[PDB]
Amino acid sequence: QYSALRSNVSMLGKVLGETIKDALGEHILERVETIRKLSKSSRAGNDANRQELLTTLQNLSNDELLPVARAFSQFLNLANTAEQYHSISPKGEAASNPEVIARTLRKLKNQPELSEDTIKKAVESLSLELVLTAHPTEITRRTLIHKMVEVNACLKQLDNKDIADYEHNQLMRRLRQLIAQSWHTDEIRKLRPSPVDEAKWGFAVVENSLWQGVPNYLRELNEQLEENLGYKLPVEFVPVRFTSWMGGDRDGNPNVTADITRHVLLLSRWKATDLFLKDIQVLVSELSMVEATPELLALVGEEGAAEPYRYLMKNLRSRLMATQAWLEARLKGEELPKPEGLLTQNEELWEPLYACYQSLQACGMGIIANGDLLDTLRRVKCFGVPLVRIDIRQESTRHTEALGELTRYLGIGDYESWSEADKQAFLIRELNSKRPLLPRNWQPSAETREVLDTCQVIAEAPQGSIAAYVISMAKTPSDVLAVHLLLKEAGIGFAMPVAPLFETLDDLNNANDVMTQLLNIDWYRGLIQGKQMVMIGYSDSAKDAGVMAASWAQYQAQDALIKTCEKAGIELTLFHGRGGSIGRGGAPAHAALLSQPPGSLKGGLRVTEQGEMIRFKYGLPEITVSSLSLYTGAILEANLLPPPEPKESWRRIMDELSVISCDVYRGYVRENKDFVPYFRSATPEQELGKLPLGSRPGGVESLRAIPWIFAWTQNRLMLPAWLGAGTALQKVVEDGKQSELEAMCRDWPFFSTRLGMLEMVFAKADLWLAEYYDQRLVDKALWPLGKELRNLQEEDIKVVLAIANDSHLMADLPWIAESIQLRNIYTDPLNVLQAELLHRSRQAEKEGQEPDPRVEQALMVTIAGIAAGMRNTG
Amino acid sequence: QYSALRSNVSMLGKVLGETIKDALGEHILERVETIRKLSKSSRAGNDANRQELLTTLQNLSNDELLPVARAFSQFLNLANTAEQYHSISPKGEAASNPEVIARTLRKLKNQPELSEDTIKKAVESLSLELVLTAHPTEITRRTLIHKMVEVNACLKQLDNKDIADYEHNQLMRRLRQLIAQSWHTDEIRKLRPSPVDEAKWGFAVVENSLWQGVPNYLRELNEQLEENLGYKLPVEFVPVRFTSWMGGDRDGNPNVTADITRHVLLLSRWKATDLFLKDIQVLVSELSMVEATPELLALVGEEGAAEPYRYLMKNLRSRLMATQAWLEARLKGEELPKPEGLLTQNEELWEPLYACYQSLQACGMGIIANGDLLDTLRRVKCFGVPLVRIDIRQESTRHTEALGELTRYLGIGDYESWSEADKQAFLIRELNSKRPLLPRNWQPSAETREVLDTCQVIAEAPQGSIAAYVISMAKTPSDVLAVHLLLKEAGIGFAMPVAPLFETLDDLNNANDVMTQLLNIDWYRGLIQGKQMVMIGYSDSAKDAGVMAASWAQYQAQDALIKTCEKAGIELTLFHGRGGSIGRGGAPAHAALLSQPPGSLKGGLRVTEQGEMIRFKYGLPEITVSSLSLYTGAILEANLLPPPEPKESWRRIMDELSVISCDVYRGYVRENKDFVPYFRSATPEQELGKLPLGSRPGGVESLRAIPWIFAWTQNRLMLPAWLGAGTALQKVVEDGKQSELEAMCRDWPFFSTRLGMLEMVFAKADLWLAEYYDQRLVDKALWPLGKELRNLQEEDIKVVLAIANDSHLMADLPWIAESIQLRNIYTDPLNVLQAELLHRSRQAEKEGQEPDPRVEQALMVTIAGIAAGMRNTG
Ligand SMILES: O=C(O)C(CP(=O)(O)O)=C(Cl)Cl
Ligand SMILES: O=C(O)C(CP(=O)(O)O)=C(Cl)Cl
Ligand SMILES: N[C@@H](CC(=O)O)C(=O)O
Ligand SMILES: N[C@@H](CC(=O)O)C(=O)O
Ligand SMILES: [Mn+2]
Ligand SMILES: [Mn+2]
């Protein structure tokens, strides 16, 4: 059924193989073949070749390491490429097929309890906001997204019979240059990327995929609405918005200073003028019609009656080149009086464009208006002047420490030592105060100053540049009020969404109480304007108590918050962190969104997309359209057909599973005193912090979530994503409640979704490679622990399969199952090679010798490649 | 066999029809349908509807004229579009199929007398230079070539089964906007275009088609050479060059002044930096490799060792932006000291690019070098700094008058009254003189000054900007020497190709004597460096004595010149004017090139492409590749397998046909005193001069060739292209020499080619529409002449068919036959409508009333549309 896929992968492999024979001989190709074959033979049980593989690897000279690593990495990359094409291909999976949306609409029409009026309102309340986050393992000096768009185009064109002989020969010639380019044009980062680089990477995603993707999705959305429901959404209604954390998230990242943020903000505005300039140039050429409505004829008046439309567009172009010119000056550190037509508000762009639209529509030229004009008009509300808004995120602790320094300096006392009650008292008092609190000439510590300057950047940036201020480690009501106070002493002249981030088991359990108390403060209710945003940190919570407990805690917290706000008349918007079932993408994501507590999506969908997944969710415009469509279908269905409330007996099983699984999980991660040492040997955890990967960088409770998950993904154990789940399920089965579990799996989405996430993690895990790493990097004294963790997975897989009444992992998702099988095959060699690299690297620093550049770079290629093949592992 | 074509035309017609129903109701659509049906019924003989058609037309209100005309014009345009796609389509005619070239190469290999060595040298001597000329009937305010490229892309994509439902729906949506745009975005020129506008039009052809077309053709050429002959041409060998007359040809065009030429020259340089800038930007991104040859490492040295290639390309970009900046200043009339890295020679661009190429090739990266780099490298030699070189053309008379004014002022005497001998004496004396002749402070007449300033522009422009100086109406040796003298007194610091243009029957007969005398002047031989260029003006010669005589005279002149130069060791390059069998394009052109006198193409191919045909020969990159390939195949075959020498008896028949046909032709065009009045009534000759068509504008001997041919093409008689040919053939048949004629047709290419050209002209002619014009615009007293000219064609068609032993016109060319049939159908209504427009227009000016703007613009649409449907008619 996937013959086209197998073929394409085989054809690309040849082109790459030939490109390698030219560059640096065929010796490298022989090595890649030997390692590939030996590795496969070792997995089959041939212990003779296992030794042969080991020897083969130790004999690779440092001069071969890089070429070899790149070979495997390239084959994987072409495999991924072929896979992505097969997904959006009509003859393949047809991911960008508008049918995905129609299927949902039709389902809703056949529902008796649903009246067209209640459905029409659900569509009008649609709201999606995707927040781009940095890519943790981007090793290339420059972004190569545009190239992949071209390789895809070649595949789309070649995917056709009745194709001319000389035409096919021409496409192949181009494809050969494209591959060759990737092999010779590879600049591994020598240094760690700066926030500004990560920000630019995000800009590349916008123009190469989102720019076309959003308008195309909106185009299809309306078309399906009218065809199935009988009406389109108003032109002014654009339910999609893109935001970013690059340059805004400074949580545990000292490199993101107030200046970097200020810089990134100008840079975004600049890029926005660059992209809108191209759009406007088109309109200035096409919109030449003469006939226009009286009103429009006014805005242009004299000198503009000859070409009314062409007129306004040229003033817009002059306007744009003006601001762009100014920005380029400010970006170079040059101060200069801001021009007249400086653009700072999307309204300034929308006004003239919308006018032209209105006119053309009236004077009988809708086909034109709803063409390129409608696209630019939508890009204005989705991207606008700032291009992509950004959130600011800092930990509660930093705010507390800065305030404590401020109070001690003024002689008021020590904020850091006051009880929660006293803090609230102090904050409410100063929030209502008209007398300033912040000293004019103050020389605070470095950290405190950064907290103060960041807030100054927020107050200076045009309104609409910053979307929200997120508070990591939020625990108490004062954590939320503190930030509102600093923003006040900064000169903020408008409402700023401040969202608490509960990223701990305890904090999630208290989340509802914390919000109840906040909403009881009359003053605070009048500040939020009936709108509150809360962030759920699933990844960090899972790292704290295990995925089982984490999941159940998240469900209860959301459900409580939904009701607490509903009752208080506050519109609650849940902000989802990275990972989890919601961050799986594709069909599973569509399902995970529906399995949330009733009302979870009434406040719209807002999720932070993980960097390592951007390519697979928004890599190409077609993929972008697919993703947004899946989300849209999920939101509508979840708001009209919410999941059933769980039976009292189910909640009791979840409470027990939560406790048992948390116990097992912390039993190893915390109690077991041989874990940490084992962890640092079996995984490349230590090198993830040292190598130049990403901007931001003790014990396990000191490590960040991403590194936690990534480390266990490199050695293929995936521990963080299953460690205690199966063991707790096993226990409940021994109590004869297996039938209760099976029932939950069938009738309670939350539960079926949790088991599904587990099935996928097991599908990517590789117990054989995990054992391989132990025998190469772990001390024989620690092998017992490793073998114990592996047997644990084997047992968990059986229990999970039994409760799902299946014979093999994720049989409900044949396509994804296949895709995974394909990627595991091409990823395999990188793992086998990485063990050797980690061994040499660790032998050098242990010998005192200096780190070998070749060994280090080769390591980066595997880390980045393995991550690219594994995708979402948590 | 042409079902795909019929379908596409029908599908586009619908989309246009629907687009019309929205814009301005369906009344217009009903009119278009009524006129279409009535016209067809009148042609069938229904005299009842003929009156109905007449009435229908007189009832059209002036407010309907424009919309209606545009409707017919649009349908024709879509018909042409469909036709062009069908030509380059693989399932269609596959015009851009590399097979066109391979077929020729294989033919040459199977030839015993041809040794691979003599063939290899023929390929190395390959030389094509295409000279773009203005489009005589371009009524749009802006160029719309880029749009047609997109409409074609939509057709290519839709031309595929296994195409997704939602994919087809998406392509159709785009196609509908494209059509709608053409219907609402139509700005008819209010004023006559300036030379600068025509020049910009030429630039649009370069970037939208030639820029990609040339490199693609060169790519295919080499690939076929190696595959069939076993070798590719050296990278430095680029046998194609593009030149233009826009801004250079001032023959009978007072609007092309020395300033316009100076301006157009800067503008070209400017555009060249714009296009090369884009090319360089790519290389600056892709060429990032580090490994480079020692030599290249030198050119970059320190600070350039990190990124050698990326280095040179950035200096090139700085270089380009520098000159571009300067040009923009000079273009605004602002003087400023020229920068340092100012580019003025192609060598400056080729140097760095070629170096990078050399390196990449050595360090094992040929796949990269022969990619985008090879393309830009070829665009350098084909276009270069000036983008497109230009020729200067002025009539001999102007040179004579300026020199006579100069000599009278100096008291030397009167050049204008000296015999040919005295002129030669004077010119040779002053050409060898070291004492200047031109006064420092002289106030000559306007005309003389223009002649002097133009030469000053040539001397100031960077060397390589002007390709040749053509002399219209060349008659004597002194005409050639005169120009060389003026260029000398101008400060010209290099060799400048000066080509005589023989555009008269007498001048063509004397051409050889004139050149023999020139080559006998030892001084003149040392000036031309063994290279001489001569221009043949077939169009003007045909207008002088008829196509038959013209053709025979051209053949004899070329043959004589070839031998005269061969004997004198001079390399002769024949420059072909517009029209004729050589300007037919496609297969006929390939044939016409081969039917030329042996040696005609040893000096390379240089022809001026007619404006009205640029779209059909270079409209799309694929069409460009097709055209250049046909030319290439023709040149090689003609230089290795020349046509057979004609039998003495054949030359005698041609001498007689020449005389008889010239007699008949001048019998009407000159002797008949009722011709001129009839001519001014039956054709829109008078309005072609008055309407704002083209830059350049008595009796018939005062009218220009283009207008001569165009006028008779609008009323569908095509008189200029056949008037005396058939009558002379008829006479020779009455002498029982029909068998001699039939023999010539079979064994002498020149002759079969001449008859073929006639068959095509008759295929486009429409005797029914020609009669329609007479009954609407010609005085009943002149009808006898008209009916006589029509019967003449009827008789000529029979004779031509008999000598070709065929039943229908051009049965040897089924595709072109079909294409013509299709175009005649969509052109038909424009002719029927134009008669009414011409009638109203002529009734107003005859009534004294002012010209109605609506009537005039509608007329322009028909003139331009009819010309677009008829294409090459002379
Ligand atoms: O829940 C969280 O802690 C996280 C992960 P981070 O603190 O490593 O960014 C998110 Cl993204 Cl919400
Ligand atoms: O032979 C000629 O006279 C012509 C036609 P023109 O004098 O109308 O440009 C050419 Cl192009 Cl060569
Ligand atoms: N994204 C898939 C897994 C994968 O393709 O790697 C899932 O979450 O189920
Ligand atoms: N170009 C064709 C005629 C035409 O297509 O109009 C020919 O010269 O034979
Ligand atoms: Mn966190
Ligand atoms: Mn002429």
Quick one: which of B626, B567, B631, B566 has its CA closest to B602? B566
Give the residues across from A466 on adjacent strands: A390
Residue type, B192: R
Q: Which of B167, B176, B286 sits opposite A185 (nearest CB)?
A: B286
Q: Do residues A560 and A598 lie in contact, with contact meaning Cβ atoms separated by under 8 Å?
A: no
Q: Could B289 and A184 be called an inter-chain contact, meaning their C-beta atoms sit closer than 8 Å?
A: yes
Which phi and psi (to 5°) does residue B469 adopt?
Answer: -120, 115
Give the span between the Cα atoms of A628 and B562, in whole angstroms: 71
Per the rule left: phi > 0, alpha: psi between -120 and 50, beta: everything else, A394 is beta
Helices (H), A89-194: 99-109, 116-124, 145-158, 165-184
**3-state SS assignment for residue A455:** helix
CA of B381 to the centre of ligand 2 (A): 28
Question: Which candidate from A23, A160, A167 shows the least CB-CB separation from B162?
Answer: A160
Residues in chain B: 874
* Cβ contact B589:B634 at 8 Å: yes
Rounded distance, CA A823 to CA A77, Å?
10
- A160 neighbourhood in chain B, CB within 8 Å: 160, 162
Residues of B designated catalytic: 135, 543
CB within 8 Å of B616: residues ≥ 6 apart: B84, B585, B623, B871
Task: State the Cα–Cα distance between residues A485 and A415, nearest whole angstrom.
Answer: 13
Q: In the beta sheet, which residues pair with residue A499?
A: A470
- Any idea which ligand is nearest the CA of A761? 3
- Report whether A769 contacts A831 (CB < 8 A): yes
| Tokens 């031998």, located at residue | B563
CA within 13 Å, CB half, B285: 12
* CB contact (8 A) between residue A371 and residue B177: yes
Provide, as residue numbers in chain B, all residues whose Cβ is less than 8 Å from the Cβ of A371. 177, 180-181
Residue A337 sits at φ, ψ, to 5 deg, of -55, 120
Rounded Cα gap, residues B176 and B167, in angstroms: 14
* Separation in Å, CA B751 to CA A734, B500, B591, B654, B721: 102, 27, 11, 9, 16
CA-CA distances (angstroms) from residue A637 to A596, A601, A644, B316, B536? 12, 10, 13, 57, 77
Do B728 and B664 touch, CB atoms closer than 8 A? yes
Q: DSSP secondary-structure letter at A684?
A: -
Cβ(A729)–Cβ(A737) below 8 Å: no
Distance CA A266, CA A461 (A): 9
Q: Do the Cβ atoms of A810 and A13 come closer than 8 Å?
A: no
Do the bridges between strand A605-609 and strand B605-609 make them parallel or antiparallel, or are there none, so unpaired? unpaired
Specify the residue with its C-alpha closest to ligand 2, atom 3. Answer: B540
**Is B44 exposed, middle or buried (CB count within 10 Å of its CB: 0-12, 13-18, 19+)?**
exposed
DSSP-assigned states of every residue in B837-868? HHHHHHHHHHHTPPPPHHHHHHHHHHHHHHHH
The CA distance from B379 to B621, in Å, is 14
Query: Which residues of chain A lie closer than 8 angstroms to B150, CB-CB?
Result: none
Q: How far is the CA of B537 from the centre of ligand 6 (A)?
A: 6
Residues of A with CB under 8 A from a CB of B: 19, 22-24, 90-91, 94, 97-99, 142, 160-164, 166-167, 176-177, 180-181, 184-185, 187, 285-286, 288-289, 364-368, 371
Rounded CA gap, A243 and A821, in Å? 34
In A, minimum Cα distance to B284 occurs at: A185
Yes or no: say if B287 and B356 are a contact pair by the CB < 8 Å rule: yes
Q: How far is residue A197's CA from residue A187's CA, in Å, rounded to a whole number?
A: 15
Q: Do A289 and B368 touch (CB under 8 A)?
A: no
DSSP secondary structure code for residue B188 in this structure: B
Residues 6+ apart with CB under 8 A from B848: none
DSSP B578: S
**Residues 6+ positions from A265 with CB-CB distance below 8 Å:** A247, A386, A390, A457, A461, A465
Nearest CA to ligand 4 atom 7: B584
Distance from CA of A465 to the nearest CA of B (A): 31
Other Cβ atoms closer than 10 A to B191: 8
Resolution (A): 2.3
Give the single-character DSSP code of A502: E
| Angstrom distance (rounded) from CA B140 to CA B92 | 31
Return the domain boundaries, chain A: 1-95+135-191+648-874, 96-134+192-647
Mark B564-582 as b/e (b = at least 16 C-beta within 10 Å). bbeeeebebbbbbbbbbbb
Strand ranges inside A625-771, DSSP E = none
Could you tell me the two tokens for B699?
């009796």
SS3 A674: coil
Q: For residue A128, what are its two tokens?
A: 């999606």
Give the list of residues 6+ apart from residue B698 with CB closer than 8 angstroms, or none.
none
> What is d(CA A268, CA A555) in angstroms, rounded to the nearest whole number?
36
Which residues are close to ligand 5, an ion, with C-beta < 5 A? Answer: A 503, 540
Three-state secondary structure call for residue B414: coil
Q: What is the largest CA-CA distance in chain A?
A: 89
How many helices and strands, by DSSP H and E, does chain A display?
A: 38, 8
- Give the type of residue at A392: I
From the list B22, B160, B187, the residue facing A160 with the nearest CB is B160
Residue pair A605/A632 in contact (Cβ under 8 Å)? The answer is no
Chain A nearest-CA residue for B364:
A23
SS3 (DSSP) at B814: helix
> B-chain residues within 8 Å CB-CB of A187?
288
Q: Is the CB of residue A760 below 6 angstroms from any atom belonging to ligand 3?
A: yes
If residue A208 lies in a helix (H) or strand (E), which one and from where to where?
A: none
Residue nearest to atom 6 of ligand 4 (CA): B871
For A20, A537, A812, B145, B151, the CA distances from B154, given in Å and listed in that order, are: 37, 48, 39, 15, 5
- Contact assessment for residue B843 and residue B96, using Cβ atoms and an 8 Å cutoff: no
Residue among A78, A26, A67, A46 at smallest CA distance from A826: A78
Q: Do B185 and A99 touch (CB under 8 A)?
A: no
**Segment (H or E) for A347:** helix A346-362
Sort out which chain A residues have CB atoms less than 8 A from B19's CB and list them: 367
Name which of B28, B141, B184 to mutate to probe chain A: the one with the most chain A Cβ atoms within 10 A of its Cβ: B184
Ligand nearest to the CA of B537: 2
Closest CA in chain B for residue A289 = B185
The dihedral over CA atoms of B518, B523, B527, B533, expressed in degrees to the nearest 10, equals: 10
Residue linked to tokens 């390789």: A151
- Confirm if A686 and A715 have CB atoms less than 8 A apart: no
Spatial separation of the C-alpha atoms in residues A247 and A253, rounded to whole Å: 10
Instruction: Name the residue of chain A whose CA is nearest to B310's CA.
Output: A185
Find the helix packing angle between B725-733 and B547-568, rounded to 10°: 90
Q: How far apart are CA B532 and CA B530, in angstroms?
A: 7
**Residue type for B173, please?**
R
Separation between Cα atoms, residue B411 and residue A109, nearest integer Å? 102
Ligand nearest to the CA of B760: 4
Q: In whole angstroms, give the CA distance from residue A786 to residue B390.
A: 80
